[PDB]
Amino acid sequence: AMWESKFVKEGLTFDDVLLVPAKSDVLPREVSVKTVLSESLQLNIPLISAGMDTVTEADMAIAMARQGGLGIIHKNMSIEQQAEQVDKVKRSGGLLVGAAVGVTADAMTRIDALVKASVDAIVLDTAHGHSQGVIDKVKEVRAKYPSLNIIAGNVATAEATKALIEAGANVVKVGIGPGSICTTRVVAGVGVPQLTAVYDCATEARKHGIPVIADGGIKYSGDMVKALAAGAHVVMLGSMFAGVAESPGETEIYQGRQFKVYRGMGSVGAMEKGLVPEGIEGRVPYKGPLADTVHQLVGGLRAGMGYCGAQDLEFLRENAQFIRMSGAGLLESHPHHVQITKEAPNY
Amino acid sequence: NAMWESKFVKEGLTFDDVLLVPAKSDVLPREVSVKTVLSESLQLNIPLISAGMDTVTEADMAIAMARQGGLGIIHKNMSIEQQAEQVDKVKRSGGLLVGAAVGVTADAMTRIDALVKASVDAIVLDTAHGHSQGVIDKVKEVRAKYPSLNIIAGNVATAEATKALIEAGANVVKVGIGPGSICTTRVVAGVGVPQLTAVYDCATEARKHGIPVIADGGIKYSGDMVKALAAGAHVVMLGSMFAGVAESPGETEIYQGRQFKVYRGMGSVGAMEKLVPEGIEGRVPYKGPLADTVHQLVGGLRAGMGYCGAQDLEFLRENAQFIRMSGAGLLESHPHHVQITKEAPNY
Amino acid sequence: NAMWESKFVKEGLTFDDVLLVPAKSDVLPREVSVKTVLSESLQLNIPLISAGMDTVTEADMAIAMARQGGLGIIHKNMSIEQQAEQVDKVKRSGGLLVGAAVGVTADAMTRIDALVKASVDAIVLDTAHGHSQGVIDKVKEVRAKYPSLNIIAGNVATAEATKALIEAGANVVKVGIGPGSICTTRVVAGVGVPQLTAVYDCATEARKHGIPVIADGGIKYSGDMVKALAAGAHVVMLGSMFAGVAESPGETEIYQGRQFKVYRGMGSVGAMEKLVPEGIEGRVPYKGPLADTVHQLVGGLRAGMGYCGAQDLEFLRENAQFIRMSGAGLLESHPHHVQITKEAPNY
Amino acid sequence: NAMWESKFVKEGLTFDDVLLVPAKSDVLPREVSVKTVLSESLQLNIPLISAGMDTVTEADMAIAMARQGGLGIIHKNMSIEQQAEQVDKVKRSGGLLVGAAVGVTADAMTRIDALVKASVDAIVLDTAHGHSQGVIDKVKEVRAKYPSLNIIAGNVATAEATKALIEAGANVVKVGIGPGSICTTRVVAGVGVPQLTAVYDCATEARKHGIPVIADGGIKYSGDMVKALAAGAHVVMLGSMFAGVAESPGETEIYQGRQFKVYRGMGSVGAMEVPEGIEGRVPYKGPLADTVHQLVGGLRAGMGYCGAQDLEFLRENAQFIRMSGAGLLESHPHHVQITKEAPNYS
Ligand SMILES: C/C(=N/O)c1cccc(C(C)(C)NC(=O)Nc2ccc(Cl)c(-c3nc(C(F)(F)F)cs3)c2)c1
Ligand SMILES: C/C(=N/O)c1cccc(C(C)(C)NC(=O)Nc2ccc(Cl)c(-c3nc(C(F)(F)F)cs3)c2)c1
Ligand SMILES: C/C(=N/O)c1cccc(C(C)(C)NC(=O)Nc2ccc(Cl)c(-c3nc(C(F)(F)F)cs3)c2)c1
Ligand SMILES: C/C(=N/O)c1cccc(C(C)(C)NC(=O)Nc2ccc(Cl)c(-c3nc(C(F)(F)F)cs3)c2)c1
Ligand SMILES: O=c1[nH]cnc2c1ncn2[C@@H]1O[C@H](COP(=O)(O)O)[C@@H](O)[C@H]1O
Ligand SMILES: O=c1[nH]cnc2c1ncn2[C@@H]1O[C@H](COP(=O)(O)O)[C@@H](O)[C@H]1O
Ligand SMILES: O=c1[nH]cnc2c1ncn2[C@@H]1O[C@H](COP(=O)(O)O)[C@@H](O)[C@H]1O
Ligand SMILES: O=c1[nH]cnc2c1ncn2[C@@H]1O[C@H](COP(=O)(O)O)[C@@H](O)[C@H]1O
Numbered sequence A: 001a002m003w004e005s006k007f008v009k010e011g012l013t014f015d016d017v018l019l020v021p022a023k024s025d026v027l028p029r030e031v032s033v034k035t036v037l038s039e040s041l042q043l044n045i046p047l048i049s050a051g052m053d054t055v056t057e058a059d060m061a062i063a064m065a066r067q068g069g070l071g072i073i074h075k076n077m078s079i080e081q082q083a084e085q086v087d088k089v090k091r092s093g094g095l096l097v098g099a100a101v102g103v104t105a106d107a108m109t110r111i112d113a114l115v116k117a118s119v120d121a122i123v124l125d126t127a128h129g130h131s132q133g134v135i136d137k138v139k140e141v142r143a144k145y146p147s148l149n150i151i152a153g154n155v156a157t158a159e160a161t162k163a164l165i166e167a168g169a170n171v172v173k174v175g176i177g178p179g180s181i182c183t184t185r186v187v188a189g190v191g192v193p194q195l196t197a198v199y200d201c202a203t204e205a206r207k208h209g210i211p212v213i214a215d216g217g218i219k220y221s222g223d224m225v226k227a228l229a230a231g232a233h234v235v236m237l238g239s240m241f242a243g244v245a246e247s248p249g250e251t252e253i254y255q256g257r258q259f260k261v262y263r264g265m266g267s268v269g270a271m272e273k274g275l276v277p278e279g280i281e282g283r284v285p286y287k288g289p290l291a292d293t294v295h296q297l298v299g300g301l302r303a304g305m306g307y308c309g310a311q312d313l314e315f316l317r318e319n320a321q322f323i324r325m326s327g328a329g330l331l332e333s334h335p336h337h338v339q340i341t342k343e344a345p346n347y
Numbered sequence B, C: 001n002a003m004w005e006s007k008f009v010k011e012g013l014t015f016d017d018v019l020l021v022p023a024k025s026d027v028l029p030r031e032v033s034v035k036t037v038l039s040e041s042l043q044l045n046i047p048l049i050s051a052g053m054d055t056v057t058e059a060d061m062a063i064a065m066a067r068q069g070g071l072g073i074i075h076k077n078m079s080i081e082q083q084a085e086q087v088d089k090v091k092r093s094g095g096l097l098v099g100a101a102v103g104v105t106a107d108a109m110t111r112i113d114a115l116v117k118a119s120v121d122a123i124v125l126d127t128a129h130g131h132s133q134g135v136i137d138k139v140k141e142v143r144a145k146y147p148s149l150n151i152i153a154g155n156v157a158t159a160e161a162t163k164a165l166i167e168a169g170a171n172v173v174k175v176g177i178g179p180g181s182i183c184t185t186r187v188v189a190g191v192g193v194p195q196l197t198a199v200y201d202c203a204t205e206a207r208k209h210g211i212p213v214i215a216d217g218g219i220k221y222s223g224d225m226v227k228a229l230a231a232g233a234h235v236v237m238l239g240s241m242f243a244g245v246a247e248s249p250g251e252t253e254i255y256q257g258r259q260f261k262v263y264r265g266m267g268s269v270g271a272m273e274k275l276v277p278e279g280i281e282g283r284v285p286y287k288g289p290l291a292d293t294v295h296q297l298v299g300g301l302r303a304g305m306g307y308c309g310a311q312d313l314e315f316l317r318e319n320a321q322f323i324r325m326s327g328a329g330l331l332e333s334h335p336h337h338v339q340i341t342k343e344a345p346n347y
Numbered sequence D: 001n002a003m004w005e006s007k008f009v010k011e012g013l014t015f016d017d018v019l020l021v022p023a024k025s026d027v028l029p030r031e032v033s034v035k036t037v038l039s040e041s042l043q044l045n046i047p048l049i050s051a052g053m054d055t056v057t058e059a060d061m062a063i064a065m066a067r068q069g070g071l072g073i074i075h076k077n078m079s080i081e082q083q084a085e086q087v088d089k090v091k092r093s094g095g096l097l098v099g100a101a102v103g104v105t106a107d108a109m110t111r112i113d114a115l116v117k118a119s120v121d122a123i124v125l126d127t128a129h130g131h132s133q134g135v136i137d138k139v140k141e142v143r144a145k146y147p148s149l150n151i152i153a154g155n156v157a158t159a160e161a162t163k164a165l166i167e168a169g170a171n172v173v174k175v176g177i178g179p180g181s182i183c184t185t186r187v188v189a190g191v192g193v194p195q196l197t198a199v200y201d202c203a204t205e206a207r208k209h210g211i212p213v214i215a216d217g218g219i220k221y222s223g224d225m226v227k228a229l230a231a232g233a234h235v236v237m238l239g240s241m242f243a244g245v246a247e248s249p250g251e252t253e254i255y256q257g258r259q260f261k262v263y264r265g266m267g268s269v270g271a272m273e274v275p276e277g278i279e280g281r282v283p284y285k286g287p288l289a290d291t292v293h294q295l296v297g298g299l300r301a302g303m304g305y306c307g308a309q310d311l312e313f314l315r316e317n318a319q320f321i322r323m324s325g326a327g328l329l330e331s332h333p334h335h336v337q338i339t340k341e342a343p344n345y346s
C-alpha cells in the first residue's frame, strides 16, 4: 500500500483559499485579539517575532513585548551574551521573552544559563522536528525543568505533532519550507503547504489541549488571519518584522532607498555566525518603527474577525469557513487592471 | 465539531475560470431585448448601473447614464444637502432615474428623508459587510418608514446573507465581497468569495423570493458582464470601466504623454480623509464620452446573447451554460503571439 | 429547473493542457502518409488550410499553398467580381485546389454563382455563430441548388451544432469559437469552448455521419497541430503562422530595424472599414517564403505520428492517447533555465 | 472505439507539482548512504550520470565524474575510433568506470565492437523514441552478440515501452521524453509525459523484473533529483547542471558581460551539423567538485527529512503531497530582494 499511495496526498497554501463571510454581531473595533499559550505565557496579540540574527534581539523583543506580543532571542551568539540580553529585556518591567536553543551537545548548558535569567519560554527549533535527537532533547529538558514553557519545531505532520507532545513540549511550532528566505523545498524537495500543515497539526494538538504556532509564509495581514482561522493560536513572523527599526539587521542602501538585511538561519552567512545551505541572503524595505506595522497587522485581523463574526480568536478557529480558489481568483483578490499610484500602509 | 471538519470543503469560481457555451440561436444580436426590471417602479432599458463612488458617479454621470437607459448612484461622500440637490438636478432633467448611496451611519435616516423628498428612485444601503446585524436592523427601520421605497442592500456573498436582507425589507440585493479592482479586502482581511460563485449562490436564494441581484465589482471586460448576467444577476454595477469617462467627477491629467483619470476606492485612505484601509488609489485611461463605452458594453452583451440564443435576459439566466477552464485556456481566450499595433475600443 | 443546476458542470481542455502519449511504433517519420480526404472531390496532400482573411490568403497565398499540397481560402472582403477573378487567377496559375469564403448575406447566392463559374473547389460559409438559424437555412439553400458542391460550414463548438449543419447539407464542418490569436470573442462576448474539447466533442458527432471537421484557430506551434489532428480533426486551419509569410497579401513594414507584416482579425475595426469589433489589429515577424514554414509544420507532424506509431492520420485520430497536465508541466515542455542563443525554425 | 473515449483520462505530474512529506527520522544527512547498484558489474557511489552530449561529457568530464563516484557517458558525435580513444583514455587513469552513447544506425554494431574492445562498462542506445520497433530490434541484436554487456536503452515514458526494452535484452531502462531543458519535442511534436509520472509508471514495470530506471532530463534543482529518486529511479542523468562546469567541453565566453558556456541539444540544428532542440548558454559554475557537492548534499538533506537510511528505503517509502501553482510560489523565496546567489539556488 506504500507504493500505490505515493502521490495521493494533496496540500493547500494561503493563496489557495479565502475566508467566507458569515453573520456578524461584533464590530471590528470590539473584538479581542488576546490568546493564551499556557497559564504562564499569555499574549495580548498573537504575534511572535522569529528568532533570527536579523529580526529579534534585545531591542526587538522589548518593543514586541510592549505591544502585547513576544520576542524570541536567536541562538547565534555566545551563551553569556544571550543570557544578558534576556535579562536586559526582563529588566524593562518584567516583559515576556523567549530564546531559541539548538539541539547541540552544549544545549543544556545554554538552557541552564537562560533559566537563571528567568526566560519565559525556550524554543527547541530545528529544521526537522520529527528527528529522534530532537525528541530525546525534549524529554531531557522537560525532566530538568518541569514548569518551563517548551516550544518545539519545526514540524508539518500530525504524527510529528503527537511525538513532540509526548516528549514534553506544551507548544508545537508548524512550518517546513514556507519562509520567504527558505529554500528547503527547492534544495531538499521536502515540504508541506502551510495551511494544510497548520490544519493537520492543530487537529492533533487540539485533542491534547496544545496550542500550535503558524511559523513562516505570512506576507500580508490577511495570511495571518487565514493561519489563525486554520487552527493556529499565534503566528510567527520574520520578513514582516525585518524591516522594522528595532531589528538587529544592518542598514544598506539600494536605489537611494533604505533597506534592512534579512537572511535565513540556513544561509551561508548565517551559518558562519552560528553542509549545504537551505536559505538565501536578502533585504526588505525599511518600514520604520514596530508600532506602525503592528497596528496594520492587528487592524487587518480585526477586520477579518468582524467579517466572520468572531468576537474572540477561539470562536474564529472553531467556526471560520474557507472557500477553495483557482489561480485566476488570486488575481481577482489583488488589485488588477488599475495603475496603483499610492501604496497603502497595508498594501 | 462539524464546523471544524468542513473548513476547506467549498469551491469557488471567478469570471476568468469559465466561458459561455454557444447554443441554438434564432435571434440576431440586434434583435435581442436588454431591458430588465428591478421593481415595478424601477425599470432599465440597459442592465448597467454606475457605482456610487466619489470618482465615478455624480450629477453629470447619473444624467448621461440615465439618458443611455442605465442608472446612476450618487455617492454619499458629500453633505446631505449637496446630495439632495444633485438628485433633484437629475430628476428635473426630463424625469430620469437616479439613485443615491446611504451608509448605515447615524445620518442615514435624515439623509434618506432629504433624498425621498427629492423624488429619489432607489437608495443603496451598501457597507463592507451586508450580513451585519446593524445593517439588517437599519433595513427594517427604513422599510417600516417607506413601504413602497426601492431599497438596495449589500454587499453580500452567501445565500444565507441574501435571505437575511430579503427578510429585512430589501427588494434588491447587491452581491460582491472583494472583487473590486481597487479593493484590498482579501489581502488585508483574507476574506472574500469568488464573484461568479457568489452571484450564483445569492441569486439562487433570491430567485425563489422573486428578488433581483446586482453583480457589483469584478468586471474588467464586456464579456465579464455577460457571464454575470448569465450567472443569475439582473443588472451589473461597474466602477473601473466608468472612471476614465469624461462624465466622471475626476479631472484629466497626463502621465507619460497619456491621458488618465484618478480612480480611488471608498476604503482607501484618500476617500476617508474627505481604521485600517481596504482600498487603494489608482489611475485609469481616459475613455472619452460615456456614450462610447456604453455602446461597447451593450454591443458586447448583444453579441453574447446572440451566441447563446437568448431572446430575453430571463432566458439567458435560466438557460445559459458555462464550461470550466484552466489557466492555459485563459491565455488562449485573450490575444496571444501577436504584437498589438492598434488599441481596440473594446480591448 | 435542471438547466440552472447544470450551469458549471462542463469542463474544457485547450492545447497547452495536454501532451500526446508515446505508443508502440513500427513506422519512421519519413515513411508516414500525411494525406487526408475531405470529399471525393477534395483531397489534400498535406492537412493545412490557410484561413480566409484579408491579411493571410489571396491569389499568391492560395497558389503557393496549393503547390505545397494544401488548400487556400480566398477571403470575402472584396466584391463578387474581385473574388471570382482571384479564384480564376489561382486555377490559371497552376493552383490545384482553391476555396472561397462566403458570408450569410442576402446576396450570398449571387456570390456563390460567380465562384462556381470560376471553378471554385469549395465554398466556406464561415460566420461567428454557425449554430444560427440563418446559417442553417443558407446551407440548405445552397445544397438544394448545388448538390455536388463542397460546402464548408462554421464556426461551431458543440456536437449539437455539428449535427445541425450536417443535416442541413454541409459535408465539412469548421470548428473554433474564440481561440484565434487575434480573436477577442471570448473577451468581448464571454463565449467560447476550449479548442481541444470542442474538436473532440464535434468530431464525436461528425464521426457517426462520416463527416470531417476542421480545427480552426488557436494553433501557435507545430505540436498544437498534431494535438488538433489527434483530437479528431481531419485538417487544421492556420492564420498567425501564415501572416508573416512573403506570399501573404500584406506588405512588409519595418519597426525598429526589423521586418513585419500586418495581421488583423476579420472582426477588427480596420477590416470592417474595407460597430462592435471582436478582433484586434497587430503585426507578426516576417518569416520569408511559405515553403519554409510549411516544411517545419509537416516535419513536426511526421515526428509526432512516429511517436504514436500512426502510419495514417486516420490511425492517429482513432488511437492516439492524451495525458493531462498542470501549468507547471507547460513550463517544463518549453525550453527552460537556459538562455536561447539563436532563433530556431521551430521555436 | 474504446480507444476514442479514453483519450483525455490520464493525468500527469511533474517535479514542481509535488513535495516530499517529512517523516520520522533517526539518521543525520552525514550518515545516510547515497550508493546505488545498476548491475552486478556496475555500482556507483553517487546516483549521478552526466548525459552523453557534445557540450556536456568528454574524457575530462568522465574522469572527474568517475573520480567523484559518478559516471560519464561519452557522446557519439565523433568518429568511432575517437570515441574508443576517449573510453580507453578514461580507463587509463585509475581504472575508472565509463560509458559511451551509441545511436541506432546500420553502422551501430561496428561502433559497439570498438567500444567493448576498449573495455567500456556500459553502452547507451539513446534515441528519440525508445518504444520504436527499430530500437527493440537493435537491443535484441546487441544482446545476442554481448551477453555480459550492460545495455542502457531509452528513452521511454510508458510502462509498455519499459516492458518491451526489458524483454528485448536491456538491463537498464532510460526514462524521459520531452523534459530536457534544451528540448522542444513537446512543442514541436506535441509528445511527452511529465517526468514524475513517467518515472513512476516506468519504475513500477521495471520493479517486477529487478531492472533499474534512469531519470533522464528535467532536473534543474537538487530537490528535483531527490524527487526523482523517491519516485522509483535508481540514478539521475543531468545535462544542464553539468554543462556550465569547467570539465565540460565548452570554452568560456563573455556575452552581456557574463561568463557562459555553450549548451546545445542533440536535436538542435547546430549539433546535427526538423530540429527538436535549441542552442543555448549556461553560466560558468567552476570545478565539477563544487556542483557535485551541492547536488549530493541536497540529497542527504532530503533523505534526512524522510528518514531514509539508504536510497532503497527512499524509493520504497517516501511519500509525496500534491500542490498548486500558488504553493509553488511559496516553495521558492518570495517577497524578498535577493542580494547573494546561493550555491544551490540561482
Ligand atoms: C466597501 C468597503 N469595502 O471594504 C469599505 C468602504 C469604506 C470603508 C471601508 C473600511 C476601510 C472602513 N472598512 C470597513 O468598514 N471594514 C469592515 C470590516 C468588517 C466589518 Cl464586520 C465592517 C462593518 N461595518 C459596519 C457598518 F458600520 F457599516 F455598519 C457593520 S460591520 C466593516 C470599507
Ligand atoms: C469570425 C468572427 N468571429 O467573431 C467575426 C468575423 C467578422 C465579423 C464579426 C463581427 C465583429 C461583425 N461579429 C459578429 O458578426 N458577431 C456575431 C455574434 C453573434 C451572432 Cl449570433 C452573430 C451572427 N451573424 C449571423 C449572420 F449575420 F452572419 F447571419 C447570424 S448570427 C454574429 C465577427
Ligand atoms: C534525443 C532526441 N530527442 O528528440 C533527438 C536527438 C537527436 C536528433 C533528434 C531528431 C531531431 C533527429 N529527431 C528525431 O529523431 N525524432 C524522432 C521522432 C519520432 C521517431 Cl518515431 C523517431 C525515431 N527514431 C528511430 C530510431 F531508429 F532512430 F531510433 C526510429 S523512429 C525520431 C532527436
Ligand atoms: C531551521 C532551519 N531550516 O532549514 C535551518 C537552520 C539552520 C541551519 C539549517 C541547515 C542549512 C544547516 N540545514 C539543516 O540543518 N538541515 C537538516 C536537514 C535534514 C535533517 Cl534530518 C536535519 C536534522 N538536524 C537535526 C539536529 F539534531 F541536528 F538538529 C536532527 S535532523 C537538518 C537549517
Ligand atoms: O534559512 C532558513 N532556512 C529554512 N527556513 C528558515 C530559515 N531561516 C528562517 N526560517 C524559517 O522561516 C520562518 C520565518 O520566515 P518568514 O516569516 O516567512 O520570512 C522562521 O521562523 C523559520 O521557521
Ligand atoms: O475601497 C474599497 N474597498 C473595497 N471595495 C470597494 C471599495 N470601494 C468600492 N468598492 C466596491 O468595489 C466596487 C468596484 O468594482 P470595480 O471597480 O468594477 O472593480 C464598488 O462598486 C464597491 O462595491
Ligand atoms: O476578428 C476576428 N474575431 C474572432 N475570430 C476571428 C477573427 N478573424 C478571424 N477569426 C477566426 O480566428 C482564426 C484565427 O486563426 P489563428 O490566428 O491561427 O489563431 C481564423 O482562422 C478565424 O477562424
Ligand atoms: O536535442 C535534444 N532533443 C530532445 N531531448 C534532448 C536533446 N538533447 C538532450 N536531450 C535530453 O535531455 C536530457 C538532459 O536534459 P537536461 O534536463 O537539461 O539535463 C538528455 O539526457 C536527453 O534525454
Ligand SMILES: [K+]
Binding pocket: A332, A333, A334, A335, A336, B178, B179, B180, B181, B182, B183, B184, B185, B186
Ligand atoms: K480586489
Ligand SMILES: [K+]
Binding pocket: B332, B333, B334, B335, B336, C178, C179, C180, C181, C182, C183, C184, C185, C186
Ligand atoms: K483569443
Ligand SMILES: [K+]
Binding pocket: C332, C333, C334, C335, C336, D178, D179, D180, D181, D182, D183, D184, D185, D186
Ligand atoms: K522541454
Ligand SMILES: [K+]
Binding pocket: A177, A178, A179, A180, A181, A182, A183, A184, A185, D330, D331, D332, D333, D334
Ligand atoms: K520558501
